[PDB]
Structure 1
């Protein structure tokens, strides 16, 4: 069974969608990626199910490194892929299923969220979740996602998705949180006064 099929079937890698091999075999879509990943030639072979030269017969230390290389390559392809009309169409199917999770804010009423990167540079920040309703970013609920790089999803993926499909934008929160103490609202003069007492401190 396919490697791309294997990677997306793994735990923690629920956010990932299966990239078409039409996209990966097309050299053009991989312009620049050969100088971002080590072992580029061999990494692409494992991804595309091409048998690896009858190499790694008994190189367990070397097979492990190509596996990290193929993992980084695929992830970098993924970030580009989900910007095209086919990559979006696959994510939009997932977004409707609720694979990415629902918004933690109470007054978004469990809004289905999207994957987003804070940085496009690998090794800078892990994957965060974007809510289309409150338009803010969150830390994934499960710890199985705290080990997935944010760059593998891109900075402007969610924003691109709503430009392509404008209709999928939910309405603004109908209700808002109003604090009450003994049934009394809190005057905002009263945090200004609370925020000092912590500074002054």
Structure 2
């Protein structure tokens, strides 16, 4: 039936992932240094590439599967910085796979996946709106378990470095607070913040 990579990216929650090319993974040079980051590297890579396994130990097979998922993730983070990765992610962005900006005045600008940290374990995946240039938590909870390190701190920044034509205009409009028609003077906030601070 389907490939490991095809299965993984097809899972519920993995909607932000694209499918990495087998060429890229089979080229040892692209995975330099990753053996020092995942347990069971040899066997994890073999699973990712749909290769013959080594099954008598039912929990060891689940430990490899985690390592395969971690390695896939870490490969992904490198892959989407490359021209072809960007090309694939850009396809997904033009379909809105990554969701849309919740800021009202961003008018549903499609967002991109971003990691707040490149180290796995530290934070889950967040979303980057290229219009307001800020970072949001995914609305759906299925995305609250995908490690950010599997996308990286530099993905969206690279993508616009490579395809600057995709960068949207800054928002035409802004929110203006009015009470009974009156704008709120900014002194009203120092004042307020003091009342919290005094409290």
TM-score by length of 1: 0.98
Secondary structure of 2:127 counterpart: strand
How far does the alpha carbon of each residue in 1:127-171 deviate from its partner, in whole angstroms, 9 at most, with x for none? 000000000000000000000101000101000000100000000
Q: CA separation in 1, counterparts of 2:56 and 2:172?
A: 62
Query: How far is the alpha carbon of 1:58 from its aligned partner?
Result: 3.0
Of stretches 163-172 and 58-67 in structure 1, the one that deviates more from structure 2 is 58-67
Query: How far is the alpha carbon of 1:176 from its aligned partner?
Result: 0.2
Query: How far is the alpha carbon of 1:35 from its aligned partner?
Result: 0.7
How far does the alpha carbon of each residue in 1:164-190 deviate from its partner, in whole angstroms, 9 at most, with x for none? 000000001001000010110000011
Q: CA separation in 2, counterparts of 1:193 and 1:36?
A: 51
Q: CA separation in 2, counterparts of 1:60 and 1:180?
A: 63
TM-score by length of 2: 0.99
Q: CA separation in 2, counterparts of 1:125 and 1:92?
A: 24
Q: CA separation in 1, counterparts of 2:52 and 2:184?
A: 67
How far does the alpha carbon of each residue in 1:47-86 deviate from its partner, in whole angstroms, 9 at most, with x for none? 0000103xxx232111010000000000000000000000
Q: CA separation in 1, counterparts of 2:10 and 2:124?
A: 20
Q: CA RMSD in A?
A: 0.5
Structure 1, unpaired ranges of 5+: none
Aligned residues: 198
Structure 2, unpaired ranges of 5+: none
